[PDB]
Amino acid sequence: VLMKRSITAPLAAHISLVNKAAVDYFFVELHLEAHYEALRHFLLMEDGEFAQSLSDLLFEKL
């Protein structure tokens, strides 16, 4: 057969390590998994004491 089988071997071994370490850095250093459950409290209006205070004040005007 013709194919790369000793040139791809130190290469594909590096691609996966790079991608998984790059994904790991975001979560365990910059807390990207917390920013989602942060925007969920406000932008989806999940949390109580915020939606019941924002909409109730805003709709009195219009």
């Binding site: 209006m45 999940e46 949390d47 109580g48 004491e49 019941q52």
Partner: protein
């Protein structure tokens, strides 16, 4: 929002102290009022924010001829609450007149807490109907709250006198308190003592200490009502948003109570819904139809099984509802409480407006009518005579409850678009 609990009578002070001890054990609080290192939760529903980060609870301790209140004092949990609310019989008329003379001082106690709070939403009244010190005094005080405060809500965590009786004056007391509950209260949570005693004798074989376990059951139900308020959810974090869905008209405001773990002192959600529809799990002992059904669960829940299971309860076709209005079984989910042991992980509660309580009300009505027409069980007491020389308030309460039973049975019919 912000709720101050009001407790009166010896039994009512017992269940309020049990409620505050349950909330001390539930939240990260010491019995001194000290905040713990693991307390984050919302604690402004029943706990006033004090100065050294103390969540001092909002309680009004009121008593009539105190005996068990000394034992309530004899505890390390009497230093957790009590922000200076202290103050010093067996008939409805006696307790009514006894509250009638002292109304100004207890109203000053209420006024102190009212001006003290930033906001307020509801009044929780914990006392037993026809329990002596609770009855009469509670109806007078209820008249005074809804006369003085029409801006708030009234919820009543009460037991109804269903214990099969010697005190024979209790149906008169229950009917007079019931008239005050129908026209001066927005919601009354009704339980049967016999059904709770049957479940308590079912789980273990107790004969005498049923009352202590019933206190724990009412404690878990009252905390279960506000777990979505104290712990961040989404909906019915206002009480009125929860109360509105069950009540179609302000005379039918009585809710059935059921709790699906019955050994309490993981499972599929459609199963515990069908379990919660049983009267073996319901705390209340012709065809009757539910008016509206809304249920709470807090525990180990699959977030996708809710639509599968609500479809399965729908296509099971198990409950038969009321043909004039478009109600639903409404599934609501709350958070399982942290900072406490998570055992019996699935815990559900139901609050539903059913016409089956009209049968129990009609039993008490028939008992009142029989003992009133026979006239050997009111016995013309001096407190009842000094309260009313003519005894027409009992007839007025009879008229109100007769109208109520008529409204009940007309709501069961498909003709309640016109008034009944």
């Amino acid at each position: 929002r912000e709720i101050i609990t009001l407790q009166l009578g010896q039994c009512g002070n017992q269940i309020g102290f049990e409620f505050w001890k349950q909330l001390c054990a539930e939240h990260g609080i010491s019995p001194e009022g000290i905040v713990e290192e693991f307390a984050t939760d919302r604690k402004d529903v029943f706990f006033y924010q004090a100065d050294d980060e103390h969540y001092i609870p909002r309680a009004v301790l009121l008593d009539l001829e105190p005996r068990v209140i000394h034992s309530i004092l004899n505890s390390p949990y009497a230093k957790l609450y009590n922000p200076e609310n202290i103050y010093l019989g067996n008939n409805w008329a006696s307790g009514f007149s006894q509250g009638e003379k002292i109304h100004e001082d207890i109203f000053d106690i209420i006024d102190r807490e009212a001006d003290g709070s930033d906001s307020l939403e509801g009044f929780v009244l914990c006392h037993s109907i026809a329990g002596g010190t609770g009855s009469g005094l509670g109806s007078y005080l209820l008249e005074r709250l809804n006369d003085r405060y029409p801006k708030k809500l009234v919820q009543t965590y009460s037991v109804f006198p269903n214990q099969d009786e010697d005190v024979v004056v209790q149906p008169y007391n229950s009917l007079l308190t019931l008239k005050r509950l129908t026209q001066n209260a927005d919601c009354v949570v009704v339980l049967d003592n016999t059904a709770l005693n049957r479940i308590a004798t079912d789980r273990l074989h107790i004969q005498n200490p049923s009352f202590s376990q019933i206190n724990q059951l009412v404690s878990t139900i009252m905390s279960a009502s506000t777990t979505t308020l104290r712990y961040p959810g989404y909906m019915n974090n206002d009480l009125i948003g929860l109360i509105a869905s069950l009540i179609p008209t302000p005379r039918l405001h009585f809710l059935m109570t059921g709790y699906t773990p019955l050994t309490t002192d993981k499972t599929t959600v459609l199963d515990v819904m069908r379990r919660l529809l049983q009267p073996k799990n319901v705390m209340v002992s012709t065809n009757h139809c539910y008016i509206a059904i809304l249920n709470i669960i807090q525990g180990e829940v699959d977030p996708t099984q809710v639509h599968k299971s609500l479809q399965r309860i729908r296509e099971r076709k198990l409950a038969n509802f009321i043909p004039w209005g478009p109600a639903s079984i409404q599934v609501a989910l709350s958070r399982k409480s942290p900072y406490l042991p998570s055992a019996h992980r699935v815990s559900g509660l139901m609050m539903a407006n059913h016409t089956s309580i009209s049968s129990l009300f009609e039993r008490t009505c028939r008992q009142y009518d029989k003992l009133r027409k026979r006239e050997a069980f009111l016995e013309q007491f001096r407190k009842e005579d000094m309260f009313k020389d003519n005894f027409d308030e009992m007839d007025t309460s009879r008229e109100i409850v007769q109208q109520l039973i008529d409204e009940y049975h007309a709501a069961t019919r498909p003709d309640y678009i016109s008034w009944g």
